[PDB]
Ligand binder design. Structure first.
Ligand code: NA
Ligand code: NA
Lengths: 240, 4, 240, 4
């Protein structure tokens, strides 16, 4: 055949892959965590968005930390040979490096480690996408006026917010990040490489959202999401 | 608007 | 005029901007830090690479933590109005969140905060690129066989290695990451958007490098770099 | 090869 190029992940396996959505809305009272009003809007938007990208979507609601770990363990032990990619969406309370089950926290690294190149062989060399709507701390953005491949290769973490910062969720509309992400996937998944889609999400969140609060501490705050890419190739959700 |  | 699009940073200001290269090779003996053999190769490669991209390059060698902070303070107080972007390259020992001056550590966040959208107004809305060749911890990758805009917007951190991991430097050839970065900038800066260039760097580092050591602990190890993007637009080093 |  003619000249071949190798710059983009193979996305024409028989299946696009799984999209696991963990939607934690109601937390055990002893944790002292509030209910995450609006997260069902996020979860439904994500389900439809990734359905249209031909992912096998599984929605899970109100999982304990133990159920989160077992679910991700079990999913990492499936045979993904016929799947192009893997997507996991986490919607919950969080801190830097941490996502909350309904009864307590889970280390993000414990979740993602199940899918390391050496621990999930049927996803080796395939893009593993983790999309995280959760706080990464308590800072507020005031804004300004205008040995063959590494085991950590081929992961992408699409964080809703910068390191150390709160993340914003509207109780009526859903979270700023998930809203924008779904809208940009809807508009551009058949046209743009994934990093360029996520860059549009960055701009949409940064420019179109600002908090409104009766509490001066939390009023008029801004947010920028945070793309963390260990991918080794371009990622297009379509193929030729 | 609420924080996570 | 006709329809206009707004998806890429304006890179046709009179100047591309500054490229500050901090090359820390020799450390005060009391710190107990080894000399970083091969870093001069990195520093020279970067100087030439960014020269050809028309950056005003400033190389600084063996700066104390105090000199690093004052340099970055002073640079952030320059008038960047006529500059399209800002680039800072840090070559040193490091840990997660930390880069070493010759006499002790500096918080990366202290350095980058000088350039926040609200603290350096002549770079507001312009891409601020921080390229970091330094360890982020001590983990080793064994590999597997095959209020208007946020103040944190418009930063890009091109880390040499994943969070928590060592980063590798060859005493003869320079660091795996800087070697690959310069080669990919040389080949693709007139052709590819910057995230796509950095993705090629990820693949080059992940596939073409593996450590050789007489010490079994440090032998046959791999590395994946880590792109952290808060950019809001596509970044091309050329313009029309 | 050395680590930073
Ligand atoms: Na959000
Ligand atoms: Na390196």
């Amino acid at each position: 055949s003619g000249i071949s190029l190798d710059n983009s992940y193979k996305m024409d396996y028989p299946e696009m892959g799984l999209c696991i959505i963990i939607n934690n809305k109601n937390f055990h009272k002893s944790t002292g965590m509030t209910s995450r009003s609006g997260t069902d809007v996020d979860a439904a938007n994500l389900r439809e968005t990734f359905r249209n990208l031909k992912y096998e979507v599984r929605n899970k609601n109100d999982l304990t930390r133990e159920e989160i770990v077992e679910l991700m363990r079990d999913v990492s032990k499936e045979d993904h040979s016929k799947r192009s990619s893997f997507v996991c969406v986490l919607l919950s309370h969080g801190e830097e490096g941490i996502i909350f089950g309904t009864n307590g926290p889970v280390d993000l690294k414990k979740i993602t480690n199940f899918f390391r190149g050496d621990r999930c062989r049927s996803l080796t060399g395939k893009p593993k996408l983790f999309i995280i709507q959760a706080c990464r701390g308590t800072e507020l953005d005031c804004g300004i006026e205008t040995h063959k491949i590494p085991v950590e290769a081929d992961f992408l973490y699409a964080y809703s917010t910068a390191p150390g910062y709160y993340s914003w969720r509207n109780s009526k509309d859903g979270s700023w990040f998930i809203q924008s992400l779904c809208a940009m996937l809807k508009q551009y998944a058949d046209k743009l490489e994934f990093m360029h889609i996520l860059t549009r999400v960055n701009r949409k969140v940064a420019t179109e959202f600002e908090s409104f609060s009766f509490d001066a501490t939390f009023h008029a705050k801004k947010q920028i999401p945070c793309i963390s890419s260990m991918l080794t190739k371009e990622l297009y959700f379509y193929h030729l | 608007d609420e924080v996570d």
